[PDB]
Structure 1
Amino acid sequence: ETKCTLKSFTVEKGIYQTSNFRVQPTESIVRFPNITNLCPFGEVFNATTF
Structure 2
Amino acid sequence: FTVEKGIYQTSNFRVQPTESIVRFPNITNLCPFGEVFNATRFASVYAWNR
Give 1 or 2 for the bigger CA radius of gyration: 2
- What RMSD over aligned residues (CA atoms) do the two structures have, in Å? 5.3
1:43 equivalent to 2:43? Answer no
**Normalized per residue, which structure has more strand?**
1
Pair 1:14–1:33, CA change in 2 (3 A): same
Identity %: 98
User: With structure 2 as the length reference, what TM-score do the two structures score?
Assistant: 0.29
Are the structure 2 counterparts of residues 21 and 47 from structure 1 closer, same or farther at C-alpha, using a change threshold of 3 Å? farther
Q: Say if 1:48 and 1:11 are closer, same or farther in 2 by CA, change over 3 A.
A: farther
Q: How far is 1:27 from its partner?
A: 1.4
5+ residue gaps, structure 1: 1-8
Give deviations 1:2-50, integer Å, cap 9, x for gaps: xxxxxxx998763135664332113111245533122334547998999
Which structure ranks higher in relative contact order (CA pairs < 8 Å, sequence separation ≥ 6)?
1
Number of equivalent positions: 42
Higher helix residue share: 1
